[PDB]
Design an enzyme around this catalytic site. Structure first.
Site, PDB file in Angstrom:
ATOM      1  N   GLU A  12      40.996  41.492  34.794  1.00  0.00           N
ATOM      2  CA  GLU A  12      42.362  41.600  35.258  1.00  0.00           C
ATOM      3  C   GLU A  12      42.878  40.164  35.346  1.00  0.00           C
ATOM      4  OE1 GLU A  12      42.298  45.056  38.240  1.00  0.00           O
ATOM      5  OE2 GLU A  12      44.400  45.129  37.406  1.00  0.00           O
ATOM      6  N   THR A  67      36.309  56.003  39.490  1.00  0.00           N
ATOM      7  CA  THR A  67      35.470  56.705  40.490  1.00  0.00           C
ATOM      8  C   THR A  67      35.384  58.151  40.160  1.00  0.00           C
ATOM      9  OG1 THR A  67      36.784  55.429  42.138  1.00  0.00           O
ATOM     10  CG2 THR A  67      34.783  56.567  42.923  1.00  0.00           C
ATOM     11  N   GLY A 101      37.454  45.718  35.485  1.00  0.00           N
ATOM     12  CA  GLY A 101      37.610  45.027  34.265  1.00  0.00           C
ATOM     13  C   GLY A 101      38.499  43.880  34.459  1.00  0.00           C
ATOM     14  N   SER A 152      41.305  53.825  46.049  1.00  0.00           N
ATOM     15  CA  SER A 152      40.754  52.823  45.162  1.00  0.00           C
ATOM     16  C   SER A 152      39.405  52.345  45.567  1.00  0.00           C
ATOM     17  CB  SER A 152      41.673  51.668  45.006  1.00  0.00           C
ATOM     18  OG  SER A 152      41.520  51.065  43.718  1.00  0.00           O
ATOM     19  N   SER A 153      38.551  52.120  44.568  1.00  0.00           N
ATOM     20  CA  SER A 153      37.189  51.629  44.778  1.00  0.00           C
ATOM     21  C   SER A 153      37.249  50.135  45.083  1.00  0.00           C
ATOM     22  CB  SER A 153      36.359  51.861  43.528  1.00  0.00           C
ATOM     23  OG  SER A 153      35.191  52.599  43.865  1.00  0.00           O
ATOM     24  N   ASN A 186      46.260  53.019  43.496  1.00  0.00           N
ATOM     25  CA  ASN A 186      45.543  54.241  43.735  1.00  0.00           C
ATOM     26  C   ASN A 186      45.640  54.588  45.232  1.00  0.00           C
ATOM     27  OD1 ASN A 186      44.121  56.462  43.447  1.00  0.00           O
ATOM     28  ND2 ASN A 186      42.306  55.526  42.528  1.00  0.00           N
ATOM     29  N   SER A 234      42.498  48.878  38.560  1.00  0.00           N
ATOM     30  CA  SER A 234      42.601  49.501  39.850  1.00  0.00           C
ATOM     31  C   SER A 234      43.089  50.932  39.825  1.00  0.00           C
ATOM     32  CB  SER A 234      43.429  48.668  40.806  1.00  0.00           C
ATOM     33  OG  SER A 234      43.109  48.971  42.160  1.00  0.00           O
ATOM     34  N   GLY A 235      44.077  51.194  39.009  1.00  0.00           N
ATOM     35  CA  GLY A 235      44.606  52.578  39.019  1.00  0.00           C
ATOM     36  C   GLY A 235      44.141  53.470  37.903  1.00  0.00           C
TER      37      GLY A 235
END
Length: 840
Positions: free
Chosen positions: A465, A183, A463, A240-241, A237, A178-179
């Site tokens: 997680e 993107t 990915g 975040s995407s 983030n 996530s972080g």
């Protein structure tokens, strides 16, 4: 130094000064004592071996600490020659620690790009860098990754190259938590393509450049729309995407841009209705209520205070690093460029507000009845109008859902709790669809007539997680990744095997993918998880519990990757664990059945289907066309084209993808996140360690080390070592990028065993490099011992020239003194003495 100019300003963040290097590689080192070691608090810290307990080890620390740890809690440390290695896979010490440590060191030095085999590791700077520098872009243009330092444009250019050179399509797989900041990269890669191979000729002029009306722009403009709708402030983030994506940049024949293609995967539908406390929903909402375009507010019939829309203010409303006002336009403008009709551009907006309103829709229990009855027609009115609906018809359908059990249509009554939940289901449903549509529409503009010969796929997804809590969504993602991984392991197997074929080494080995097939089959195969999952979804009276049992009765004890959970640790409940490449994931099966059914009140959908708002009408069509197929109670939705599984597509899409990925030359990029705390130049250990395992990085090192650990890419081999037999190694490297390295190794008093060549690289042992040195060591005794001698010799040779000179000056001194000792007592001489003065 000489080379670096192109970057110049970026240089320091790409490469280090030629002495910084030199001062680092050429320093004292004690192999037998220097080591890496386990550590209860900090993951692995470095130290010096003190003693040896026969199978225990006592070590000092770097901070000052002494620990007696097992023999295998102890790991060697690379000679200084490998300080901040561009390609860790060239190291002669393929460990867990050495990898962590290399990344870390070149980060504290502000180098974010380090390679680990094929990968292109990337670490979040958390600050600004001249790397994306418009000078660099050129610099990396036309350069093999051995002709330049570790960087993403390397990957990105090579792709291009390779694209035209081999006449094969390419891909870039970006992945991280996530972080990690993917993107950002993705985008950045994309610009890269657009720049280095554009030329719309007419569109290039400084006249509303990049506005709607050109792609290179459209291509670009795409992002900022999707981002308003599929992005949000995560606790990690700020942008975040919340979805995955795959773009196909269709290059032409010449090599100039021709088309693009987006595809979206797994959107976080829940944000639309929920939000954690430190998070927030999609931007759009906050964008819109920002008030930069006041009409909008009145147009949508909302306020500017988000606390009026429960759905969107459960968490946070404002983020300091984001200017909702600026974005609103960005967004706005993008829509236009994207070619959307005002109307559509109106639907989008109007539709995005309806959704807010829904969450405001309130209900109450009918008296003496357990039925839901509308608690007012204030909001409904707005939602109704905004969607091109009728308030009433709407509230009915909602309250008195008219179903079709048997061969007819049976009117069913709902509860208060049932409504609130159904509403939410549409809110989400609608948003999603829309989002999907937007993408399609985008794609539509991004469609040109010009011929296409190849494309370059850029895949951005999450990915693997692991959470203490793993639900359905996790499985879907993990599954995606476990596939992606195998995809690599194979490419590597294929790749490896070419070298040993090119060189002539004799190494046999089985596909590395194979190791994972076990897990994959269990998920995707017929009597596997998904199936059992998607079958039960057909049973009108099945339970999560039901499903569960079916899962076991069939896989438990019979399947190895299948296991019953470990309920305790940081985990929250029990159902089933799986054994993925990254590790064991404990999955909770609760809601699955539902989530997987995508239950939607069909009466309402009906209304949508006949809206005055075409767009809204459109979005629903595909539901309206499969109803034929699931006419009566029970049965199969697919008969009419309706989804039977929440998972039925995901798979279909994931297949269409992994297939597109195959007719591609895979190019890998692994994004990393240093510290949860957001601090540049820092790194938590175990946090990075994690990523590394789930990344594939640690698995690529494994496969490497099976064997011949460090593996050097040829150019990367030339540059760094030409200097060793300078004349003959340079000639080799220049004369044939590969044949060179070959030729080079011609010289040196090195073990011509310890290595092995192949199609893309050389293979090298460690304890090999260790072997090398040794030989080397002897070779200097020779060199030195001989150079000492002459010196020694010569040294005394000058002593003789002095001794000799001196010869007489002594005598002079010698005799001269003696005189005096004799004389000084002589009358005559004393006389002369007292008298010697009166003279002149």
């Amino acid at each position: 130094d000489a080379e670096m100019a192109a970057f110049g300003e970026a240089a320091p963040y790409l490469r280090k000064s030629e002495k910084e290097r030199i001062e680092a590689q050429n320093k004292p080192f004690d192999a037998k004592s220097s080591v890496f070691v386990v550590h209860p608090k900090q993951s692995f810290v470095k130290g010096t071996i003190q003693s040896k307990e026969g199978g225990k080890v006592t070590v000092k620390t770097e901070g000052g600490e002494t620990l007696t740890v097992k023999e295998d809690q102890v790991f060697s440390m690379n000679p200084p020659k490998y300080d901040k290695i561009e390609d860790m896979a060239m190291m002669t010490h393929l460990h867990e620690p050495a990898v962590l440590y290399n990344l870390k060191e070149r980060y504290a030095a502000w180098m974010i790009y380090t390679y680990s085999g094929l990968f292109c590791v990337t670490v979040n700077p958390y600050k600004w860098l001249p790397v994306y520098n418009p000078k660099v872009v050129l610099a990396y243009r036309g350069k093999k990754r051995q002709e330049a330092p570790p960087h993403i444009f390397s990957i990105s250019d090579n792709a291009y190259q390779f694209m035209l050179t081999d006449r094969e399509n390419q891909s870039i797989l970006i992945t991280g938590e996530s972080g990690a900041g993917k993107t950002v990269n993705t985008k950045r890669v994309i610009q890269y393509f657009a720049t280095i191979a554009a030329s719309g000729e007419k569109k290039k002029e400084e006249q509303s450049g990049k506005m709607q009306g050109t792609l290179e722009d459209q291509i670009i403009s795409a992002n900022p729309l999707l981002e308003a709708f599929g992005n949000a402030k995560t606790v990690r983030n700020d942008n975040s995407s919340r979805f995955g994506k795959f773009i196909r940049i269709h290059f032409g024949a010449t090599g100039k841009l021709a088309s693009a293609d987006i595809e979206t995967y797994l959107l976080e539908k829940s944000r639309v209705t929920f939000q954690l406390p430190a998070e927030r929903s999609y931007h759009i909402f906050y964008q819109i209520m920002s008030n930069k375009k006041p009409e909008l507010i009145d147009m949508l019939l909302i306020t500017t205070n988000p606390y009026d829309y429960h759905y969107v203010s459960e968490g946070e409303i404002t983020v300091p690093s984001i200017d909702d006002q600026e974005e609103l336009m960005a967004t706005d403008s993008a829509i236009d460029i994207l070619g959307f009709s005002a109307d559509e551009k109106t639907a989008i907006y109007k539709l995005t507000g309806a959704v807010m309103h829904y969450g405001n829709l309130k209900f109450k229990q009918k008296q003496r009845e357990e039925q839901a009855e509308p608690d007012g027609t204030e909001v409904a009115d707005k939602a109704a109008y905004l969607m091109g609906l009728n308030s009433a018809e709407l509230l009915k359908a909602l309250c008195y859902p008219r179903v079709g059990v048997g061969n007819e249509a049976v009117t069913k009554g709902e509860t208060v709790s049932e409504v609130h939940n159904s509403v939410g289901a549409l809110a989400k449903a609608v948003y999603e669809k829309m989002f999907l549509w937007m993408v399609i529409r985008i794609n539509q503009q991004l469609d040109t007539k010009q011929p296409r010969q190849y494309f370059i796929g850029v895949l951005d997804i999450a990915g693997f997680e692991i959470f203490d809590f793993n639900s359905f969504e996790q499985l879907c993602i993990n599954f995606t990744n476990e596939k992606l991984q195998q995809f690599f392991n194979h490419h590597m197997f294929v790749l490896e095997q070419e070298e040993y074929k090119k060189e002539g080494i004799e190494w046999e080995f089985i596909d590395f993918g194979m190791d994972l097939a076990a897990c994959i089959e269990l998920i995707e195969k017929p009597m596997g998880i998904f199936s059992i999952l998607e079958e039960e979804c057909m049973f009108p009276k099945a339970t999560d519990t039901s499903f569960k049992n079916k899962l076991y009765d069939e896989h438990l004890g019979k399947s190895n990757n299948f296991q019953k959970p470990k309920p305790a640790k940081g985990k929250a409940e029990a159902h089933f664990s799986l054994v993925h490449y990254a590790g064991t994931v404990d999955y909770n099966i609760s809601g699955w059945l539902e989530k997987n059914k995508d239950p939607l009140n069909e009466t309402v959908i009906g209304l949508y289907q006949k809206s005055s708002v075409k767009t809204l009408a459109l979005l629903f069509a595909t539901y309206g066309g499969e109803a034929e197929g699931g006419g009566g109670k029970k049965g199969g939705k697919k008969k009419g084209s309706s989804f039977q599984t929440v998972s039925a597509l995901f798979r279909e899409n994931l297949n269409k993808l992994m297939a597109n990925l195959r007719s591609t030359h895979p190019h890998f990029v692994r994004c990393i996140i240093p510290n949860e705390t957001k601090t540049p130049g820092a790194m938590e250990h175990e946090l990075v360690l994690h990523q590394l395992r789930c990344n594939g990085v640690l698995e690529g090192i494994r496969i490497c080390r099976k064997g011949f650990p460090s593996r050097v890419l040829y150019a990367d081999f030339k540059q760094r070592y030409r200097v060793l037999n300078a004349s003959a190694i340079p000639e080799g490297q220049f004369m044939d990028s590969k044949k060179a390295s070959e030729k080079l190794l011609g010289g040196g008093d090195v073990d011509h065993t310890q290595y092995a060549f192949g199609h893309t690289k050389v293979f090298f042992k460690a304890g090999l490099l260790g072997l090398l040195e040794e030989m080397r060591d002897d070779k200097l005794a020779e060199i030195i011992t001989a150079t000492q001698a002459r010196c020694r010799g010569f040294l005394m040779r000058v002593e003789y020239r002095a001794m000799v000179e001196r010869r007489e000056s002594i005598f002079c001194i010698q005799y001269n003194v003696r005189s005096f000792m004799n004389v000084k007592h002589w009358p005559w001489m004393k006389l002369f003495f007292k008298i010697k003065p009166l003279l002149k």
